[PDB]
């Protein structure tokens, strides 16, 4: 059947006249991943909007519009259409026209990426606003978007996973629930009735440490100390011996004034192996290399592998000139998105499931693993980010894991 839990049904009904909490100005759902909160939240938003207004404008925001469409709008579309709603997607325009029982409203899509994101939601007048991944958004974009919700009866809807305790959304919204007159429902995987006791426990084994506390337990816990505290040389390091690899990639972090790194990654029996590393530090050497010199080193680095098994070079986005040279030379290139927090989370998960393993010649990588830490002072201000020192192999690994194994 795939039935809804008690907590999911509250998301669907809170706003109705029969509900005790219908006068609340909005809702916040936070907590764990895979909790079946995102799709009910979005469905309930459209349902509430279509039932309460006609010919109004409504907002929907993600970290980017692309992500919003992937995470919410596409599954929301399919689900809306199956229960008698109709949808038109004005692609470039970035809004939807939704129709139900002779009523029509307009749903505008936004991205809340940076301090300029606030400038794109100044004109429009709104009867509601929905934020997916609000803990990934700037406070300024959310202050504006909420200020554009001027129509009488307007409600605010927030969906997120936890960040740190000092994060603005925890401090200004979740700790001020009665002040803002919002409802709050906290989800864990127990609220998702379609997951067995086995599958829930499998998801539990994908996370340890801070990311386990946030994405499984749903706790707003501070990031502190070693980032990859699940990395373990008893489990993640293997001998440097030949294996019959079926597929290869190279991942690259670029530096002229910082080190440049290559990692050769090789697939064997379901696991991607870091076969070796290249580590050129121009500062230590007292000699900087050019794009051409690094191209030459990269050709040496991949000499002894069959060209039909090499699937390309994953490159740090800022190395645009280097990418042009590689394409000019016939080398396939994939630009890494460089989504930092999601990449770090995904590297951690790759280690926990042993999706990756390292040859013991990757000695520079291992030195970075032992030193790569969270920015302590930033975390205590609400900003989760690494201290960007001795992370040149680790950034390349992240590009590889995040581009090929996730995404
Ligand atoms: Cl969800
Ligand atoms: Cl979030």
Author numbering: 11 to 417
Give the original sentences from the paper that presented this experimental model.
A central component of the motor, large terminase, consists of an N-terminal adenosine triphosphatase (ATPase) domain comprising ASCE (Additional Strand Catalytic glutamate) and lid subdomains, and a C-terminal nuclease domain, connected by a short linker sequence. The nuclease domain is responsible for cleavage of the genomic DNA concatemer at both the initiation and completion stages of viral DNA packaging.
Subsequent soaking of these crystals in cryo-protectant containing a high concentration of NaCl resulted in a transition from R32 to C2 crystal form (Crystal form 2) with each of the ATPase domains of the three subunits related by the crystallographic 3-fold axis adopting a unique stable position. In common with other phages, the N-terminal ATPase domain of the D6E terminase comprises both an ASCE and lid subdomains facing each other. From the lid subdomain, the polypeptide chain leads, through an ordered linker comprising 12 amino acids (230–241), into the C-terminal nuclease domain. The nuclease domain resembles the RNase H-like fold which, as found for the large terminases of other viruses, differs from other RNase H family proteins by an extended β-sheet and the presence of an auxiliary β-hairpin. The relative position of the ATPase and nuclease domains is stabilized by a salt bridge formed between R224 of the lid subdomain and D394 of the hairpin-like loop, and an interdomain hydrogen bond (M216-N362). For comparison, areas buried in inter-domain interactions in T4 and Sf6, are significantly smaller, 212 and 78 Å2, respectively. It is possible the distinct domain arrangement of the D6E large terminase stabilized by these interactions represents a biologically important conformationally locked inactive ‘initiation’ state that serves to prevent futile hydrolysis of ATP before assembly of this extremophilic motor.
